[PDB]
Amino acid sequence: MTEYKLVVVGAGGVGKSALTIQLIQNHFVDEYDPTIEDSYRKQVVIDGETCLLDILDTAGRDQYMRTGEGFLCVFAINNTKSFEDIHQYREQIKRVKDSDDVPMVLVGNKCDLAARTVESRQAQDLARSYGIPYIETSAKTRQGVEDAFYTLVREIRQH
């Protein structure tokens, strides 16, 4: 079956693992557990198409960026530093893949938190400048999780 090689990147602690575990294991990991490198393979049905999601959950590079087909670039809405770091991930991915239009979704996670420091407007404008979608998520409530991953799969389909 069709396989989608997804890679989740972003600053340490923004919720890359929490988002992935929510999608695949249907629960919120509310504990400290830094990632080195974890892989998740799951058969799913997206828009009627049977496919395999091969998700690489990374640590907060060139090798995995090269094989990845789509990227979720994640930052946390209560961590301005993580938002400012997005540019560096974006540039490295573009360089390694020799492409300025790589399937990608900008993800603003932890949207359940009231202590926001990154305005949705600034993230939206950045995404617009990259020509990619901006989606806010909460690995805690599961809001926007399937949306983020499925949108990424669709971006790959339309590449």
Contacts of 100 (CB under 8 A, 6+ apart): 94
CB of 45 vs ligand GNP, minimal distance in Å: 25
Give the Å distances, CA to CA, from 144 to 2, 40, 136, 139, 149.
24, 19, 6, 8, 9
- Measured CA to CA, the distance from residue 101 to residue 8 in angstroms comes to 17
Q: Give strand pairing partners of 37.
A: 58
Binders of ligand GNP among residues 49 to 108 (CB under 6 A) are 59-60
**Which of 54, 112, 146, 147 lies at the binding interface for ligand GNP (CB under 6 A)?**
112
Residue nearest to ligand GNP (CB): 60
Binding of residue 17 to Mg ion (CB under 5 A): yes
Nearer to ligand GNP, 54 or 112 (CB): 112
Contacts of 36 (CB under 8 A, 6+ apart): 59
Rg (CA), the chain: 14
Nearer to ligand GNP, 30 or 98 (CB): 30
What torsion do the CA atoms of 78, 32, 15, 3 make, to the nearest 10 degrees?
170
Nearer to ligand GNP, 16 or 97 (CB): 16
Binders of ligand GNP among residues 4 to 43 (CB under 6 A) are 12-18, 29-30, 32-35
**Which of 55, 65, 139, 156 lies at the binding interface for ligand GNP (CB under 6 A)?**
139
Query: What is the contact surface with Mg ion in residues (CB under 5 A)?
Result: 16-17, 35
Would you tell me which residues interact with ligand GNP (CB under 6 A)? 12-18, 29-30, 32-35, 59-60, 109-110, 112-113, 138-140
